Amino acid sequence: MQIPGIIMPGLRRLTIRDLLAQGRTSSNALEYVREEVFTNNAPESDITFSKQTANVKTIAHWVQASRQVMDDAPMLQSYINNRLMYGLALKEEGQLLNGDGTGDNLEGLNKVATAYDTSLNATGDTRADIIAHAIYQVTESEFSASGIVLNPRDWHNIALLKDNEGRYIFGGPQAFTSNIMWGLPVVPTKAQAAGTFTVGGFDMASQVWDRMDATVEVSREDRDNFVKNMLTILCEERLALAHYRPTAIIKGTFSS
Amino acid sequence: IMPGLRRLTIRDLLAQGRTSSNALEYVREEVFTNNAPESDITFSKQTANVKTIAHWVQASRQVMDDAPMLQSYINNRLMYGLALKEEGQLLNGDGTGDNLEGLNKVATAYDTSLNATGDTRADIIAHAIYQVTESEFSASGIVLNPRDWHNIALLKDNEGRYIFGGPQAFTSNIMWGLPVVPTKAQAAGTFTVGGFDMASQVWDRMDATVEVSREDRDNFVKNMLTILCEERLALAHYRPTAIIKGTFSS
Amino acid sequence: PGLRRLTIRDLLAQGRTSSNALEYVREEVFTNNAPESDITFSKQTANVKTIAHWVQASRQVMDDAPMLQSYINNRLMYGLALKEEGQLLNGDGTGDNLEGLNKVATAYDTSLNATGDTRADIIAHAIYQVTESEFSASGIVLNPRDWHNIALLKDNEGRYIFGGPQAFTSNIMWGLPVVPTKAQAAGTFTVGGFDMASQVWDRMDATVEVSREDRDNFVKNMLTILCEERLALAHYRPTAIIKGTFSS
Amino acid sequence: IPGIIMPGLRRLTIRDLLAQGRTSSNALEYVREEVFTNNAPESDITFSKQTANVKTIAHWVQASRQVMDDAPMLQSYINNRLMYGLALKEEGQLLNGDGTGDNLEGLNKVATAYDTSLNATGDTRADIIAHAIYQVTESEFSASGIVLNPRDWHNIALLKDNEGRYIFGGPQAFTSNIMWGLPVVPTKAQAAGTFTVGGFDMASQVWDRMDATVEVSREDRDNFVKNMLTILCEERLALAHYRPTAIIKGTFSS
Amino acid sequence: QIPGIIMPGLRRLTIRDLLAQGRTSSNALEYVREEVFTNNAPESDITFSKQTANVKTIAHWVQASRQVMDDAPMLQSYINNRLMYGLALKEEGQLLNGDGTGDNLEGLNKVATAYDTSLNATGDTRADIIAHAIYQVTESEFSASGIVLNPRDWHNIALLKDNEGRYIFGGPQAFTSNIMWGLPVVPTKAQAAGTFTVGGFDMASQVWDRMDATVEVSREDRDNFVKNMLTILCEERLALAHYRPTAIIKGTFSS
Amino acid sequence: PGLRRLTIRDLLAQGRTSSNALEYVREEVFTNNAPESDITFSKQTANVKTIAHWVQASRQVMDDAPMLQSYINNRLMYGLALKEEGQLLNGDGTGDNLEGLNKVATAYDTSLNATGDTRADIIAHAIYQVTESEFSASGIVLNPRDWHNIALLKDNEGRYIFGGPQAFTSNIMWGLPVVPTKAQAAGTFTVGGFDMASQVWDRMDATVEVSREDRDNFVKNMLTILCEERLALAHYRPTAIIKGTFSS
Amino acid sequence: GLRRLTIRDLLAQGRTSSNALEYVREEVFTNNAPESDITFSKQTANVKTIAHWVQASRQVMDDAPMLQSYINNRLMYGLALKEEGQLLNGDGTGDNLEGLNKVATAYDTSLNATGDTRADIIAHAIYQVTESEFSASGIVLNPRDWHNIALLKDNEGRYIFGGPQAFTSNIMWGLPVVPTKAQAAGTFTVGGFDMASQVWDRMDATVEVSREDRDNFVKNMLTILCEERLALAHYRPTAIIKGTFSS
């Protein structure tokens, strides 16, 4: 195997990747701190510290194809793009969002994020109100919300909604296509579960580290993939995710 | 240009690409709807040819002069017949002769045991999305007949209430956050759902071109030259299980 | 021209030609036949009719003054489009007139009018009737009056069918641009894929001429001002254009 | 004979709504599209000859002799006071113009009245304006600009929709904060409770026969004794109304 | 030395901004303002009475640290907010109302025309009181410009309710906009409670400027100088004029 | 960099110096009755204290990759200023801390609340006592929680005091810069003419240092990262500031 | 010294240039006779740091001879006795390492003779080790659990294997003993440490000194430290057996 290394991916949608601070690294794992912020009553509302450490996992996306033709037609160039890179990038969120943080899985935000305090929403509160409450809870962490992670479906719903008046709230469909909400960007992705929403100040909350930029490789000899004249194409990336302040994030579920 | 694209065609729904061969081989991820364990996926050494689709609309024999005049007719009136027509082979095809292996050809039959008592003309679709996940994939979008879409959108209960129905919805051509593609190329009552995002891409060999024959078939008899816009494509299937076909119990 | 609406001319494809007459085939589709569902061509021909707008004033002062230019260029010029949309929108293709879209347009299935529909629900059904041509809806054409109602139209729900009246502004109705005008008679409406259902060819640019002996200008000491525009309409798949009126 | 300099109020005026023009004649004629609010048929447009004449608008005010043309205090006296009032006075003519004498044929006078028969029951000031923007189309012309009084505009600027929600938006230079995209011009000329709209863009046009010139006196009346020099600033122009039906005038009948 | 530009807070437009702007070059200036008679229907013509305006000098003083002055960066930021903002509060006291004696100016209230008390009613709302003012402004066929009154009074005027919590035309926001009846408002403290002023200050009279606000620093000089350890100052020369006092109304809220 | 929320430091006048301390005159304005309402003077002086933000972490990554900058760059500073407001908003004049506005602010006039005034009606009256200083209000400071409730508040008539939940975003209230910060204790508010009543001077831009040498950061693989900043807060006319609380 | 390199001289050593180790751990399968094959389980090992600190004064201090002798003669060795803790009884969280005892395997009582001594048990352990297909290398005991053993006497009033004369240093059954206090009395451990696991030294022993540390600068007094960064691994857990004298 060798590397027809190079071609990068591009989507018209803002990946969770962009939502988190960008910083490269040169290691297999690093150690940081966790501002264990106590939703402490009025006084010593001070934030404890926690000696935590994160490991650099690796994400990969593969797919088989024919040798001859592939290795002959520019189909490859484009093959990896809309297929591999598109998939890999898409799968990436799967970890940065609902990561499991086990074996090769990254510690997903949601899995770390703090639950939603349903204590705030009160009678007669449209889903819009719910989010209004959310934006707040994310403040008790001394951090302001940055953006919202919502599922396409439930985004469509929230996007276009009146108000017991012909008034349309937020402007959808006009501004409904991702774009923004209340002024905070929205990241609609398949990964995000239905009815389940997550909001926080990812701007200053958590950060991502890169150990090796995504790269593709192909092996004419994998799994008897030689006798069946069908080499395999793979694209992997090395990185680790560090969740500084958890409370800076909240995960909830609309009133289903 | 072809931007009477007041909708997004399947071509825009599927994943784009491009090749230099006249045909290409690929591994069909024969995904079994295996039970919890294995339940494992299999692979098949398949392939995809390259057909040449084109649209034609015979015109009068004089317009041949006014250049700027002829120009747009082509771009505008003409592509659409191209792409529209193109959208056909992509959707469903006999996969024989010059017909591409349309999605329907390979699409997986819609499970009937999933149909309740007992379920609205839309609930059926709802189930589809789920059956799609039965292949370890998500839902890219839905493809159904432009009429049926009307019934779904402009639909109320015993009372006058637009359930996820809203003339607005039709305008958006999207439901459950999934892109809807109203195309008359597919018979009514029929519908297709799956993760086309990566369920199957398309390869572009030769872009749209234009050829006219005064001499050719009907143009003599039509008595006017017949324009023609060629195009060369290659449809592939990486996981047919990520595609479901069926109809509404009527 | 003007600065406000959106001239039907924008909806219909554009272009130009040299000959004063054109030829083309008409996809006259056999729409609703649950048997061989196809289309039959109809070799047609386009006629380059010259349209112009009348406008009097007085020449002698004017042929000296600079501003009159800033007049027809900005003002009178508009008077052309308004009159232009007229012929296109509809007219007896008799004479120097063109085949108006309404003339060649198709009827409107009243069967779709289900109990419970509103004057706003009508146009909705129309949108569908368009798909019958294999094409899709691009824009809608109505008059200020009806549009007004439809726009600022509440319901027993105690709310607007679209948001606040603002709706009226920036004619967009469910992602489909609207165009209010006088050319469209009251109660009458039209929809379809104008973008690709018909193409307009521009022969020559609008030319202007002035005179006093014109009409009864020799009695009002006012010189006539006119601007002739040679244009010609063409219809490909008329079945795409839907014509109809409200029940009220 | 004065050195010269131009002027302009802070925000815009009606002088910006009407299509600009100019002429070298003391007058000129034109034609009027008597548009009948004719029922569905022969809704045709009758015609009228009609004639426009060049009028003169000037503002004057007096001040010291030896203290005047001896200090740059002059310009400031014109640029801020004379000009300021000139353009301000100008609006009145265009807007509320009497016609007779040096008076310009006011728009409001020629403008078509409002159709009260066109309001429904639970209507607010906002709704009315909407109805207005509509009646402007019956003239085959689209709305183009709004003209209300500050004491009234300020009102519409802040309204709740039966819910706290602000319409047109919060107060933001509310005037600049033009409504329905269409521009707004709140002046003292227009009366309180009274408004005028229409397609000023094409409804009428303006012609400038002479720019703003200034002259002194020192000789006038009985000012030679009290040494009260009289400063005057005039200008020559003509207002022409083409399709009066393209402009509506109404009032919020309280 | 020579400065560039003032720049006060700008959270409210001072009378200066309300009045007509102007600039003279003479240490004195004459003018004619017709004394408009509140003449009955006929010869309601306005008499032309000659007048004369004196160019007074106004000084604004701010204590300056000796150290602060030496560095350029430290001194300037305080100063720009510092000179213009201080001046507007300062200029009022002379512009709004002054004996127009010694170094004072012809205060608006000084030449202001007393309110017509014979316009009041059984009990017009404290707001209607002002309403009459605007009307009387017509006494001189002049369109009222803005209204200047005491900040406190403004409060009571804004926050008004009927037998219900019905924030009258007024309300919390309106107070923020400082504009009622579509007319500018200048809630300057220079005005005492019950003391108000209405009229078309836009053209009712213009103020001329002789010399921009300068700055002088001394250690020994002034009462503070004894305090030490350094001094700062703003000299400015302006001239308030009045062509038609009838265009200005004073009066007082009694009640 | 990009904080979103408008920091006090953006509500108070700004300027710089080269010294370690400043002198000025505190216009002790008496809330003096109608007559000698004149303002006394006090020879006050400001001290250029020093504040910073420290964090501990294993240099394992802090010195094995240039991404460390990247951390201190747009991530930490944000933490600095975030604590910067601490001192300003309220700080014990004792020690390195600065003259906290609250510590220098004037009490609130309870005489203004009246049965029937809503949380919002209070802060309203507060804006008044600001005029007492002969200056007007420029911005308010409340705890995020408070701002919340205050924002989307309603009454019988199903309406918001500001017409929409959105009010929250784009902090504004009657056109007055609102700054929601944890720095402000709940049930506590503070208003005034911060614009022209208190200035801040810069003595040294934000700086950072690194030294494992500190405390026991050596025996334990770690490192203390921190970035000091030199400032000085002045209070010319403190009366221009009010503070008080609510019910809870 | 112990001259038995504590716990370290018993495990395969090596070096590393990272902070994490992704090794393959052979989850062996005693199982039964047939598919006695050994599974595999991706495992990760973090790199933790540990050092030994000792206080000292400077006047009597910065003497090259003295200093450069105190350290590599005493200090360096003293650190070993400390790191031995983590290796032996290590935890998995914080700055702790995955100690063998934590991954060790429970001793089979089943082999205990009707009537035998503590020494006999160890033998069983050795055998139980070969079960993992791997031969045993060393033994771990607690001084005292080594005391009685060294004094196990036949009612025949005579030591067991032991004679003051007939004897050597730490060694039993042909394998080292490495007596250590870090090991809880009663609880022992045996296994083929040779291939059982191996440690990786990210960096050799480094010694640094500081004055501004705590209250030394005042109490003129100094602090010397010997930082050490390393991490161990674990292959066949069944190779390490931990037992607790039920007696």
D158 interfacial to chain E (CB closer than 8 Å): yes
Interface test with G, best of F56, F219, F220 (most G CBs within 10 A): F219
- Answer whether B100's CB lies under 8 Å from B14's CB: no
Which pair of tokens denotes residue E136?
Answer: 């009387």
Q: What are phi and psi of C121, to 5 degrees?
A: -75, -25
Looking at beta carbons, which residues of chain B come within 8 Å of C41? 57-58, 222
Which two structure tokens, joined as six digits, stand for D239? 């207002």
Report the run of H or E that residue D92 belongs to, with start and end.
Answer: helix D83-96
* B160 CA: distance to closest CA in chain C (Å): 8
d(CA B152, CA C117): 16
Residue E48: which of D77, D150, D228 has the nearest Cβ? Answer: D228
Cα–Cα dist C179/C101, whole Å: 15
Which residue bears the tokens 């640019």? C205
- Find out whether F49 and A10 touch, Cβ atoms under 8 Å: no
N-to-C CA span, chain G: 32
DSSP state of A174: T
End-to-end CA distance of chain C: 35
Contact present, B165 and B154 (Cβ < 8 Å): yes
Beta-carbon separation of F25 and E187 below 8 A: no
Rounded to an integer, what distance in angstroms lies between the CA atom of residue E92 and that of residue E106?
11
- Residue type, position A226, single letter: F
Q: Between chains, do D166 and F161 touch, taking CB under 8 Å as contact?
A: no
Query: Does G208 sit within 8 Å of F213, measured CB to CB?
Result: no
Question: CB neighbours of B173 closer than 8 A, spacing ≥ 6?
Answer: B7, B8, B149, B179, B180, B181, B182
A87: part of which helix (H) or strand (E)? helix A86-96
Name the strand (E) or helix (H) holding D195: strand D194-198
**Rg over CA atoms, chain F:** 21
Give the separation between CA B163 and CA B145, rounded to whole angstroms.
20
> Which residue from G122, G128, G159 is spatially nearest to G141, judged by alpha carbons?
G122
Neighbouring subunits of E (3+ Cβ pairs under 8 A):
D, F
Q: Is C92 exposed, middle or buried (0-12, 13-18, 19+ CB in 10 A)?
A: exposed
D165 contacts A163? CB cut-off 8 A: yes
Torsion of CA B24, B25, B26, B28, to 10 degrees: 120
Minimum-distance CB partner of A69 among B17, B25, B43:
B25
Residue in chain E lying closest to F174 (CA): E173
Interface of G with A in 94-113 (CB under 8 A): 94-95
Residue E41 CB partners (closer than 8 Å, separation 6+): none
The structure tokens 């007007």 sit at F136
Amino acid at E133: A
Which residues lie closer than 8 Å to E219 by C-beta, 6 or more apart?
E66, E225, E228, E229, E230, E231
DSSP C240: G
DSSP state of A193: P
Please give the DSSP secondary-structure letter assigned to residue C74: I
- Buried b / exposed e over G29-53, threshold 16 CB at 10 Å, is eeeeeeeeebeeeebbbbbbbbbbb
State the chains in contact with A (3 or more Cβ–Cβ pairs under 8 Å). Answer: B, C, D, F, G
Residues 6+ apart with CB under 8 A from C125: B150, B154, C108, C109, C112, C113, C117
Give the Cα separation of F71 and A31 in Å (integer). 14
Angle at B244 between CA B238 and CA B246, to 5 degrees: 145
CA distance B244 to B237: 13
- Cα–Cα distance, E157 to E169 (Å, whole number): 9
Which helix (H) or strand (E) is C59 found in, with range?
helix C59-62
Can you say how many angstroms the Cα of residue G42 is from the centroid of all Cα atoms in its chain?
24
* DSSP conformation letters of B155-181: ---SSS--SS--HHHHHHTEETTEEEE
The sign of the CA dihedral E147, E148, E150, E154 is: positive
Whether omega for the bond prior to residue F204 falls within 30 degrees of 0, making it cis, is: no
Backbone angles phi, psi at E211, to 5 degrees: -155, 125
Task: Find out whether the peptide bond into E8 is cis, omega within 30 degrees of 0.
Answer: no
- DSSP H stretches of helix in chain B: 10-13, 67-72, 79-91, 103-106, 123-133, 146-153, 167-172, 196-199, 217-222
Is the bond leading into B39 cis (omega within 30 degrees of zero)? Answer: yes
Please report residues of E whose CB lies closer than 8 A to that of D188.
143
- Under 8 Å CB-to-CB from F187, ≥6 apart: which residues? F143, F146, F245, F246, F247, F248
Q: Which two tokens stand for residue C80?
A: 């052309």
Distance between CA atoms of residues D151 and D183, nearest Å: 17
* Length reported for chain E: 255
Task: Kindly determine whether residue A82 and residue B15, on different chains, have CB atoms separated by under 8 Å.
Answer: yes
- Closest to C233 (Cα-Cα) out of C190, C202, C192, C193: C202
List the 39-68 stretch of D: residues with Cβ below 8 A of C. Answer: 40, 43, 47, 49
Strands (E), chain E: 20-21, 28-36, 46-54, 56-60, 146-149, 179-180, 183-187, 196-199, 206-211, 234-240, 248-249
CB atoms within 10 A of CB B52: 11
What resolution in angstroms, rounded to 1 decimal?
5.2
Spatial distance between the Cα atoms of G37 and C234, rounded to a whole number of angstroms = 82
Q: Which two tokens stand for residue C165?
A: 């009246």
Question: Torsion over CA of A79, A85, A90 and A91, rounded to 10 degrees?
Answer: 100
- Give the torsion sign (CA, A49, A50, A53, A59): negative
Size of interface A-D (CB pairs under 8 A): 10
Tokens 């008059």 found at: C143
E196 CB-near residues (< 8 Å, 6+ apart)? E130, E133, E147, E148, E149, E150, E153, E250, E251, E252, E253
Residue E173 phi/psi, 5-degree rounding, is -65, -55
- For strand A147-149 and strand A196-200, is the pairing parallel, antiparallel, or unpaired? antiparallel
Element (H, E) at C29: strand C27-29
Helix or strand or coil: residue E117?
A: helix
Contacts of C22 in chain B (CB under 8 A): 60, 62-63, 66, 69
Residue A225 to residue A67: CA distance in whole angstroms: 10
Say which DSSP state A186 is in.
B
Residue A193 and residue B138: Cα distance in Å, rounded?
Answer: 11
Residue E25, helix vs strand vs coil: coil
Q: Are G232 and G87 in contact (CB under 8 A)?
A: yes
Amino acid present at F226: L
| Three-state SS annotation for chain G | CCCCCCCHHHCEEEECCCCEEEEEEEECCCCCCCCCCCEEEEEEEECEEEEEEEEECCCCCCCHHHHHHHHHHHHHHHHHHHHHHHHHCCCCCCCCCCCHHHHCEECCHHHCCCCCCHHHHHHHHHHHHHCCCCCCCEEECCCCCCHHHHCCEECCCEECCCCCCCCCCCCECCECCCCCCCCCCCEEEEECHHHHCEEEEEEEEEEEEECCCCCCCCCCCEEEEEEEEEEECCCCHHHEEEEECCC
Report whether G231 contacts G200 (CB < 8 A): yes
Q: How far is CA A212 from CA C61, F66, G122, in A?
A: 80, 15, 49
Q: Is G242 exposed, middle or buried (0-12, 13-18, 19+ CB in 10 A)?
A: buried
Question: Min CA distance, G201 vs chain F (Å)?
Answer: 15
Which DSSP state fits E243?
S
Six token digits for residue A68: 């001859």
Sign of the torsion angle spanned by Cα atoms E1, E6, E9, E14: positive
Given a contact cutoff of 8 angstroms between Cβ atoms, the answer to whether D198 and D247 are in contact is: yes
Q: What is the DSSP string of C115-183?
A: TT--HHHHHHHHHHHHHTTT----EEEE-HHHHHHHHT-EETTTEESSSSGGGGSS-EETTEEEEE-SS
Q: Nearest CB to F164: which of D162, D164, D171?
A: D164
Residue of chain C nearest D33, judged by CA positions: C55
Interatomic CA distance for residues F130 and F115, integer angstroms: 22
* DSSP letter (8 states) at residue F161: T
CA distance C182 to D141: 9
E209 contacts E22 by C-beta, under 8 angstroms: yes
Tell me the C-alpha distance between B241 and B109, whole Å.
Answer: 9
Decide if F181 contacts F141 (C-beta within 8 A).
yes
> The tokens 């005010």 sit on which residue?
D61
Q: In 3-state terms, what secondary structure has residue F13?
A: strand
Radius of gyration of chain E (CA): 21
How was this entry determined?
A: X-ray
- CB-based contacts of B74, cutoff 8 Å, min separation 6: B210, B227, B229
How far apart are the C-alpha atoms of G125 and G135, rounded to whole Å? Answer: 11
Contact yes or no for A69 and B15 at CB 8 A: no
How far is it, in rounded angstroms, from Cα E193 to Cα B92?
85
DSSP strand pairing (D112-113 vs G222-232): unpaired
Using the Cβ of D160 and the Cβ atoms of chain F, whether some distance falls under 8 Å is answered with yes
Q: How far apart are CA G110 and CA G128, in angstroms?
A: 11
Q: How far apart are CA B186 and CA C128, in angstroms?
A: 16
Task: Give how far Cα G178 sits from Cα of D61, G81, G90, Å.
Answer: 115, 11, 17
Residues A215 and A234: their CA atoms lie apart, in Å, by: 8
Nearest Cα neighbor of B173 from E224, C127, C64, G149 is C127
The dihedral region occupied by D227, where left means phi > 0, alpha psi between -120 and 50, and beta the remainder, is: left
A30/F61 CB distance under 8 A? yes
Q: What's the Rg (C-alpha) of chain B?
A: 21
CA B136 from chain center: how many Å? 22
The CA-atom distances, in angstroms, between C228 and each of C51, C80, C140, C204 are: 6, 9, 28, 9
Measured CA to CA, the distance from residue A66 to residue A75 in angstroms comes to 11
- Alpha helical stretches, state H, chain E: 15-18, 66-70, 72-95, 108-111, 128-136, 151-158, 172-177, 201-204, 222-227
Give the separation between CA A52 and CA A207, rounded to whole angstroms: 14
Do residues F147 and F178 touch, judged by C-beta distance below 8 A? yes
d(CA G11, CA G197): 6
Among residues D92, D109, D84, D105, the alpha carbon closest in space to that of D187 is found at D92
Q: What is the CA radius of gyration of chain G?
A: 21
Query: Backbone phi, then psi, for A49, in 5-degree steps?
Result: -120, 150
Separation of alpha carbons C118 and C153, rounded Å = 10
Q: What is the CA radius of gyration of chain D?
A: 21
Interface test with D, best of E36, E49, E50 (most D CBs within 10 A): E50
Cα–Cα distance measured from residue G71 to residue G4, given in angstroms and rounded to the nearest whole number: 19
DSSP B136: T
**Exposure pattern of C220-234 as b/e (b: 16+ CB <10 Å)?**
bebbbbbbebbbbbb
